[PDB]
């Protein structure tokens, strides 16, 4: 990842600082506290997980293939109306040279 | 109320990724954000027709998920394509640089 | 300062505007105002046009135009130093006199 | 040239089934339901002028 | 020109710039007429044209 | 089967969609706890305790309004609190489902012409008390004008060739102004000589002709070949 | 391919890292060096601004 | 770069010369270093890696 | 003012009670809500040196193009309006009667030069701060926002010592030192 | 205790919805490809042929000296049944008194008429509208700009006065 330096970081404007949340060293109440459930609930956790996942990853499977898709329809469509222009631009001289 | 859309706030999310369930189904691309005034139903087959659509007494269940779980079929599928994302996800990350470092390390 | 009165042509609303700056519409028998705006300019004289829904206010130079619930509507580069408004109704003109020797026929519903 | 025709004739009515919906025969079985989803906004009718 | 004072110069620029124009341009678009309207642009040529 | 859906509301008012893994057209049920034509049901406890409230799976191979609403009609008429006019009752099938999607505080006037379709539809209507079965010929509506009044839409599953008129005296006496006209064409029911296309143009003529702008038109085509919806509204001075 | 032999436009296999040379793995070739580069050359302007 | 020279005098012979990694990165060998024998120093287009391999095109 | 129906609309078409020709289509509003300015009579009071500007470079254009009278007080016109503020660039002489305006004098007022300087959030902000006095050019403070802020004088715009504004910033990035009082 | 940066409230015309710039405060359609159509082919359409003429197709006619049902069955091979709608024979009509002979050969028992339901008459609106509606009608015209507009509409045969005979194109079954 991009590694600003602690120099240039310190001394950014108010709306460029940049929001790097330390991690946590002491087991704090909240998390020693928090209840997770088991067994029935866990395998549904996972469940869910994969889920979510294979949702994801088809999603921009599809959607990176629907961007090869389309800049290939982008260059064959680009020489088709660079095609068409020169006609219109031969055309157009062949109008006003008769005329 | 947040109270009942915590209980049925997972079959929510199987709703909104029916896409990905079976491999061979492929719905028609809606978004389908959670609707705000919905109801959760059950359907009765009747007592005139059986043994073509009959869930039996002793696999009727109470959510989408506890169905989609004990499917044995489904869950093959969904760990062996959970593991091929997971290592096309990891290929070249971090275990695979400090592996790299070691292998120029070694000698 | 001194308070210059008006009445709206049903009795129902009254206008009054200070020397200083201070001009309010009103219904004077509820006691309902609908405008109370301090202009801190020297103000002169106002009157109703058609309606307590818009009045006229001859302030310092110019003369001003302002809806029922008194934000500005108009400043006319007309009507250089008004001392006397009056509208006529069924004509639809507010007439615009003063220190200047000219006398303006305004039509306020053109413009 | 009678098998190249046979796979392009397969080929156009695989593909006239996603330009249309082609009638393919009415309810087969038990109603099981739409199978692919039920969109609440699209409208696929054809306005007059 | 290096002698003409106000008007005559602004007319006279235009009036070159208009003749040159004209060859290239598009005739709907050189010469636009000053918006004006009907009532008073009808008298005004009415009284021109008498 | 025994399975569970999630039932959320159409863009048309008075119908649902009941969502699984395949999703459902569905309308509330009037008369709770049987079914009429052996669809099947889906029951919600809505919350004295919670009632359990159901609801009936609407079947578009055996339902031409619900083969139009499903592939997608910009603008039913038939809503919840109207009064419908249903011509051609065949039986009770499509007409409980326009019932309930009516609601109670709305009517139904199936007319059916047949007798013994007319006792199945007399028995439907006593546990659906927002229909009224009118046994008698579309054609003759002054034989039937006594029992009717002013109807917001009426909707056509007649299969006559002499449709649009049947469709246009049903109109004209108990349609009001800018209400709403739904028809079912049925092509080799008019006629089969000439193709679909000609059958169906003919027949939106018909119905300008009669004065019934025509908004829009829906083939629905993989429940019915050759069939058509029409949906127009009763315009009844300057369809212009 | 207008007047070009199939035969002509074949496929040139790629190269792999010596085998002497192996604890430094992978012999990157250009599109390796690209990816590697105008990683860089972001990173760099987003320092700069 | 370490052995494409035996000697400091067969990189002198050869000083100035274009290289290129198998990257295609270009480069120039600029001076022979002195206490390892056949190892000079080479500039190139950007930073070159330890996995790569440079290239001298002769005839 | 009711929504008039087909035959009223189309038989009294020019009434309107708000819009009117001789509003110019509310831009002194316009620009004293975009610029927040106080009394009503400053876009006026701008609008006649803008006509000053405009009248001057009509006059001075209908010279002859060549003589130095022209280009000297057109280049010095120019460079004076240039260094003022209002001009954004001193290039071409079309700026003297399309570039000056009244937002552009508008834009070089007190409160606008700090909302640019990122000083105050907004516009209103600024006109609120150097209401409250804490905005000081040079060493003298600075009290009412119509101050204009030539292109040198913007180097000095900075709040006045013991602000608490100053103090709140100092003490963001805990650079305060109380010896200096902030 | 007054409020800071007080301002004269004026109106705005950017927000203000009492005057009449100001006083402008999803179901998607996406019309099926017609069932009758293969790809570009209209397998639907049948002899009986119905046609829809205009006004210069008309027009080319008389002055081709060709007459109309005729020349339509020599030129399909079929019976054809000719159509003008109103607005065509609206503009026959406004065409003045020049255009008398073809206004009453227009009026022929054997050419039926249709009956338009809009405003204005617009004949190639009328046309291209009525016919991308049902993709039944074969259109008769020699407009250039109609011609083009029916031929980029897919599945609809046109028809035209070319040399001292109809022509047909996008009718793919003419022999
Ligand atoms: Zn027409």
Not at chain 2, 50 to 64: H, L, V
Not at chain 3, 47 to 64: D, I, M, P, S, W
Not at chain 10, 18 to 31: A, G, S, V, W
Request: with cysteine.
């Amino acid at each position: 990842g991009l590694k600003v330096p602690k120099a240039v970081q310190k001394e950014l404007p108010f709306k460029s600082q940049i929001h790097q949340m330390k991690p946590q060293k002491k087991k704090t109440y909240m998390a020693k506290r928090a209840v997770v459930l088991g067994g029935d609930e866990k395998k549904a956790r996972s469940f869910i997980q994969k889920v979510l996942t294979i949702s994801k990853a088809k999603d921009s499977k599809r959607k990176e293939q629907k961007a090869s898709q389309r800049k290939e329809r982008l260059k064959k469509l680009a020489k088709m109306e660079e095609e068409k222009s020169q006609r219109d631009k031969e055309k157009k001289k062949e109008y006003f040279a008769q005329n | 109320d947040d109270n009942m859309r915590r209980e049925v706030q997972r079959d929510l999310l199987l709703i909104k990724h029916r896409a990905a369930l079976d491999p061979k189904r492929h719905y028609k691309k809606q978004r389908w954000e959670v609707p705000e005034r919905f109801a959760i139903g059950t359907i009765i087959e009747d007592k005139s027709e059986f043994y073509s659509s009959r869930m039996n007494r002793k696999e009727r269940k109470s959510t989408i998920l506890e169905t989609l779980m004990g499917d044995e079929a489904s869950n093959k599928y969904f760990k062996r394509k959970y593991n091929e994302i997971q290592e096309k996800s990891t290929s070249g990350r971090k275990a695979h640089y400090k592996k790299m470092k070691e292998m120029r390390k070694k000698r | 300062g001194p308070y210059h009165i008006k009445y709206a042509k049903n009795g129902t609303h009254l206008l009054i505007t200070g020397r200083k700056g201070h001009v309010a519409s009103m219904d004077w028998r509820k006691g309902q105002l609908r405008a109370e705006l301090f202009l801190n300019e020297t103000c002169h004289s106002a009157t109703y046009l058609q309606n307590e829904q818009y009045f006229a206010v001859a302030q310092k130079k110019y003369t001003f135009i302002y809806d029922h619930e008194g934000t500005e509507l108009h400043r006319l580069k007309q009507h250089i130093e008004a001392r006397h408004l009056d509208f006529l109704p069924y004509h639809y003109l507010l007439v615009t006199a003063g220190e200047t020797g000219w006398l303006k026929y305004h039509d306020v519903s053109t413009g | 040239s009678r098998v190249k025709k046979r796979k392009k004739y397969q080929k156009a009515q695989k593909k006239l089934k996603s330009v249309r919906a082609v009638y393919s025969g009415g309810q087969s079985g038990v109603y099981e339901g739409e199978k692919t989803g039920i969109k609440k906004g699209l409208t696929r009718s054809v306005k007059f002028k | 020109d290096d002698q003409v004072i106000g008007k005559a110069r602004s007319r006279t620029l235009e009036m070159r710039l208009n003749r040159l124009s004209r060859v290239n341009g598009h005739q709907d678009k050189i010469n636009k007429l000053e918006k004006v309207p009907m009532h008073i642009r009808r008298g005004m040529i009415d009284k021109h044209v008498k | 089967g025994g399975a569970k859906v999630v039932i959320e509301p159409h863009r048309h008012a008075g119908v649902y969609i009941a969502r699984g893994k395949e999703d459902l057209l569905v309308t509330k049920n009037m008369a709770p706890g049987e079914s009429v034509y052996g669809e099947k049901r889906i029951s919600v406890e809505e919350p004295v305790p919670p009632t359990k409230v159901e609801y009936r799976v609407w079947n578009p191979f055996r339902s031409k309004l619900a083969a139009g609403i499903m592939g997608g009609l910009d603008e039913l008429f038939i809503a919840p609190g109207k009064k419908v006019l249903y011509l051609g009752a065949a039986s009770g099938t499509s007409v409980s489902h326009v019932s309930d999607v009516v609601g109670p505080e709305g009517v139904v006037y199936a007319v059916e012409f047949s007798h013994r379709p007319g006792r199945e539809l007399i028995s439907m209507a006593k546990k659906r008390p927002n229909i009224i079965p009118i046994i008698e010929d579309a054609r003759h509506p002054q034989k039937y004008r006594m029992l009717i009044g002013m109807v917001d839409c009426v909707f056509a599953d007649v299969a006559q060739p002499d449709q649009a008129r049947i469709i246009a005296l049903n109109s004209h006496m108990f349609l009001k102004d800018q209400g709403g006209v739904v028809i079912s064409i049925k092509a080799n029911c008019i006629d089969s000589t000439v193709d679909a296309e000609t059958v169906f143009a003919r027949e939106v003529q018909k119905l300008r002709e009669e004065r019934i702008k025509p908004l829009e038109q829906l083939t629905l085509e993989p429940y019915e070949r050759d069939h058509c919806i029409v949906v127009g509204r009763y315009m009844r001075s300057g369809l212009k | 391919a207008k007047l070009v032999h199939d035969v002509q436009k074949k496929q040139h296999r790629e190269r792999s890292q010596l085998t002497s040379r192996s604890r430094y793995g992978f012999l990157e070739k250009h599109k390796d060096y690209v990816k590697r580069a105008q990683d860089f050359h972001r990173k760099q302007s987003t320092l700069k601004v | 770069i370490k052995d494409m020279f035996s000697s400091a005098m067969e990189v002198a012979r050869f000083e100035g010369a274009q290289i290129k990694t198998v990257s295609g990165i270009r480069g120039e060998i600029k001076r022979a270093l002195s206490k390892p024998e056949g190892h000079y120093r080479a500039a190139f287009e950007d930073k070159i890696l330890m996995s790569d391999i440079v290239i001298l095109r002769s005839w | 003012v009711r929504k008039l129906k087909h035959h009223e609309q189309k038989l009294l078409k020019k009434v309107d009670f708000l819009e009117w020709k001789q509003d110019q289509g509310h831009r002194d509003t316009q620009v004293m809500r975009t610029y927040h300015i106080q009394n009503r009579e400053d876009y006026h009071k701008y609008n006649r040196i803008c006509g000053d500007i405009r009248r001057l470079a009509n006059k001075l254009s209908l010279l002859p193009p060549t003589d130095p009278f022209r280009r000297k007080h057109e280049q010095l016109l120019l460079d004076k309006l240039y260094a003022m503020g209002v001009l954004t660039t001193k290039s071409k002489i079309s700026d003297l009667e399309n570039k000056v305006t009244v937002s552009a004098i508008c834009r070089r007022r007190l409160p606008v030069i700090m909302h640019r300087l990122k000083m105050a959030e907004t516009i209103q902000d600024a006109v609120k701060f150097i209401e409250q006095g804490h905005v000081r050019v040079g060493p003298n403070l600075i009290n009412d926002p119509a101050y204009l802020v030539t292109r040198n004088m913007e180097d000095y715009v900075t709040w006045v010592d013991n602000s608490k504004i100053k103090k709140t910033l100092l003490r963001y990035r805990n650079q305060i030192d109380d010896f200096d009082f902030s | 205790t007054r409020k800071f940066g007080l301002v004269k409230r004026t109106l705005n015309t950017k927000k203000d919805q009492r005057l009449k710039k100001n006083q402008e405060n999803l179901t998607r359609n996406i019309p099926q490809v017609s069932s009758a159509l293969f790809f570009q082919y209209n397998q639907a359409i049948k002899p009986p042929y119905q046609v829809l003429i205009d006004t210069n197709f008309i027009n080319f006619s008389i002055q081709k000296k060709v007459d109309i049902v005729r020349g339509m069955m020599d030129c399909l091979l079929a019976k054809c049944n000719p159509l003008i709608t109103d607005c065509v024979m609206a503009e026959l009509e406004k065409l003045g008194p020049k255009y008398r002979i073809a206004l009453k050969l227009a009026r022929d028992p054997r050419i039926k008429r249709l009956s338009c339901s809009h405003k204005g008459t617009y004949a190639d609106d009328c046309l291209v509208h009525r016919v991308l509606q049902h993709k039944c009608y074969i259109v008769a015209t020699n407009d250039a700009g109609l011609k083009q507009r029916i031929r980029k509409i897919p599945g609809i045969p046109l028809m035209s006065v070319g040399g001292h005979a109809y022509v047909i194109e996008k009718l793919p079954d003419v022999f």
